[PDB]
Amino acid sequence: YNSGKLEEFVQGNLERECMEEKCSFEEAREVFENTERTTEFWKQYVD
């Protein structure tokens, strides 16, 4: 869930971060970065 140590400097993997453990909508919007794409994605991942 992006504790903020040695996982920000990695590439872009929405799974290792968002799927596996935990994650904010914002989190997606850094790798993903298309916040529209990520909100739709968000409506099948939130709740």
From Swiss-Prot:
Binding residues annotated for Ca(2+) 7, in chain numbering: D47
Effect on the protein of changing Y45C: In HEMB; moderate
Result of changing E8D: In HEMB; uncertain significance; no effect on protein abundance; loss of function in blood coagulation
Whole sequence portion shown: 47 to 93 of 461
Organism: Homo sapiens (Human)
Consequence of substituting E8G: In HEMB; severe; HB151; Gla mutant
UniProt effect for mutating E7A: In HEMB; severe; Oxford-B2; Gla mutant
Impact reported for E20V: In HEMB; moderate
Binding residues annotated for Mg(2+) 2, in chain numbering: E26, E30
Effect upon mutating G12A: In HEMB; severe; Hong Kong-1
Binding sites annotated in the UniProt record for Ca(2+) 2: N2, E7, E8, E17, E27
Protein's recorded name: Coagulation factor IXa light chain
Effect after changing D47G: In HEMB; moderate; Alabama
Residues annotated as glycosylated: T39
Disulfide bridges in this chain: C18-C23
Binding residues annotated for Mg(2+) 3, in chain numbering: E36, E40
Binding residues annotated for Mg(2+) 1, in chain numbering: E15, E20
Residues that coordinate or bind Ca(2+) 4: E15, E20
Binding site for Ca(2+) 1: Y1, E7, E17, E21
Chain positions recorded as Ca(2+) 3 binding sites: E8, E17, E27, E30
Binding site for Ca(2+) 6: E36, E40
Residue numbers binding Ca(2+) 5: E26, E30
Ranges for domain Gla: 1-46
Positions of modified residues (4-carboxyglutamate): E7, E8, E15, E17, E20, E21, E26, E27, E30, E33, E36, E40
Source taxon at top rank: Eukaryota
